[PDB]
Swiss-Prot record:
Family the UniProt entry places it in: Belongs to the protein kinase superfamily. Ser/Thr protein kinase family.
Organism name: Arabidopsis thaliana
SS bonds (residue pairs): C1-C69, C5-C131, C67-C129
Induction pattern: Induced upon treatment with chitin oligosaccharide elicitor and flagellin (e.g. flg22).
Tissues expressing the protein: Expressed ubiquitously, with lowest expression in pollen.
Post-translational modifications reported in the UniProt record: Autophosphorylated. Autophosphorylation is induced by chitin and derivatives. Ubiquitinated and targeted to the proteasome by hopAB2/avrPtoB of Pseudomonas syringae pv. tomato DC3000.
Record function comment: Lysin motif (LysM) receptor kinase that functions as a cell surface receptor in chitin elicitor (chitooligosaccharides) signaling leading to innate immunity toward both biotic and abiotic stresses (e.g. tolerance to salinity, heavy-metal stresses, and Botrytis cinerea infection). Recognizes microbe-derived N-acetylglucosamine (NAG)-containing ligands. Involved in the resistance to pathogenic fungi Alternaria brassicicola and Erysiphe cichoracearum, probably by sensing microbe-associated molecular patterns (MAMP) and pathogen-associated molecular patterns (PAMP).
Record's protein name: Chitin elicitor receptor kinase 1
Glycosylated residue positions: N16, N28, N78, N99, N128
Phenotype of the disrupted gene, per the record: Complete loss of response to the chitin elicitor, including loss of MAPK activation, generation of reactive oxygen species, and transcriptional activation. Impaired chitin-mediated resistance against biotic and abiotic stresses such as tolerance to salinity, heavy-metal stresses, and Botrytis cinerea infection. Reduced resistance to incompatible fungi such as Erysiphe cichoracearum and Alternaria brassicicola. Enhanced susceptibility to Pseudomonas syringae pv. tomato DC3000 associated with peptidoglycan insensitivity. Impaired chitin-induced phosphorylation of PBL27.
Residue ranges occupied by any LysM domain in the UniProt entry: 22-50, 84-116, 144-187
Effect on the protein upon substituting A114H: Slower chitin-mediated phosphorylation
Assembly description: Forms homodimers and homooligomers. Homodimerization is required to trigger plant defenses. Binds to chitin, chitosan and chito-oligomer oligosaccharide elicitors. Interaction with chitin octamer (NAG(8)) promotes homodimerization while shorter chitin oligomers inhibit homodimerization. Interacts with Pseudomonas syringae hopAB2/avrPtoB. Interacts (preferentially when unphosphorylated) with PBL27 at the plasma membrane. Binds to IOS1.
Lineage, opening ranks: Eukaryota, Viridiplantae, Streptophyta, Embryophyta, Tracheophyta
Binding site for chitin: Q85, E86, D87, T88, Y89, E90, R91, P113, A114, T115, N116, I117, P118, L119
């Protein structure tokens, strides 16, 4: 890979009842180790969360995770997921991982036929990330993998991220930020609200 960085952030949209524990379980990693007791690694990136035990539907939770070079020379991370009753690749992608992965990606990289995924199988779940692009800006080196929703637009994400629309578009060239699907990469802040800069 041409770029590298020590972490990325995943944007997990809340619907149908998701708790912080389930997010931490699904997105467990060395960077956010799930122990059911200490959620500080996640909470540091979400100062807006007043009560970790009662999170608000319709909001997004930012989760830090490692951002590693993958075969095929792109950046991402392999999460692991223990299969539960009635899981399907579609449901795991759209619901359990909140569009941070795709059903096609899951099906390609796991050996279970779509119609036979047994209880307690483990899935390899790929979520992509970015470390930035020096030709766009030297000012950003931490990125949110942000699945687009119908309510998002370039202007709304620019406003909420505090990053200019032109910079956002240059990081995501040719991508319509109002399309309501797929992922865009948005510069993110450290726990104190500063943007970590790009690092070669
Ligand atoms: C994330 O998980 C995936 C799936 O378990 C890992 O995938 C695979 O990685 C290995 C190399 O680490 C690749 O095996 C290699 O295959 C090539 C040719 O196919 C062969 O010449 C090598 O000797 C080696 O056996 C495999 O192709 C690759 N598969 C895919 C789908 O990309 C991946 O490595 C994990 N990422 C990390 C950072 O560990
Ligand atoms: C969360 O993910 C991490 C990273 O994959 C897991 O880390 C392993 O932890 C065991 C026991 O502490 C170590 O022996 C391994 O060396 C770690 N693996 C790696 C690759 O670092 C961790 O166990 C996971 N936690 C849960 C609840 O699944
Ligand atoms: C992941 O994306 C899917 C597809 O856009 C979202 O599910 C759609 O949600 C709308 C309601 O908002 C429904 O009308 C569609 O029928 C759904 N499509 C499918 C295929 O189920 C889903 O909400 C997204 N997940 C998250 C957590 O945001
Ligand atoms: C993560 O990024 C990789 C690399 O761009 C994506 O992999 C490609 O996926 C497309 C569509 O399925 C395939 O046509 C290509 O063969 C893949 N390229 C490589 C190098 O594997 C991948 O789809 C992205 N994953 C997610 C979950 O967004
Ligand atoms: C939420 O539940 C409804 C009703 O079952 C379903 O249509 C929708 O797909 C669910 N959303 C997610 C994220 O799976």
């Amino acid at each position: 890979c041409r770029t590298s960085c020590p972490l990325a952030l995943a944007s997990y949209y809340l619907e149908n009842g998701t708790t912080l524990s389930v997010i931490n379980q699904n997105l467990n990693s060395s960077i956010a180790p799930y122990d059911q007791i200490n959620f500080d690694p996640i909470l540091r990136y979400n100062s807006n969360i007043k009560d970790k035990d009662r999170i608000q539907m319709g909001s997004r939770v930012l989760v830090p995770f490692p951002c590693e070079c993958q075969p095929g020379d792109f950046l991402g991370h392999n999460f692991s997921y223990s299969v539960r009753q009635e899981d399907t690749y579609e449901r795991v992608a759209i619901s359990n991982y909140a569009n941070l992965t795709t059903m096609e990606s899951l099906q390609a990289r796991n050996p279970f036929p779509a119609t036979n995924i047994p209880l307690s199988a483990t899935l390899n779940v790929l979520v992509n990330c970015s470390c930035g692009d020096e030709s766009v800006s030297k000012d950003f080196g931490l990125f949110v993998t942000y699945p687009l929703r119908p309510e998002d637009s370039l202007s709304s994400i620019a406003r909420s991220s505090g990053v200019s629309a032109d910079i956002l578009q240059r990081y995501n060239p040719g991508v319509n930020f109002n399309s309501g699907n797929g992922i865009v990469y948005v510069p993110g802040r450290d726990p104190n609200g500063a943007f970590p800069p790009f690092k070669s």
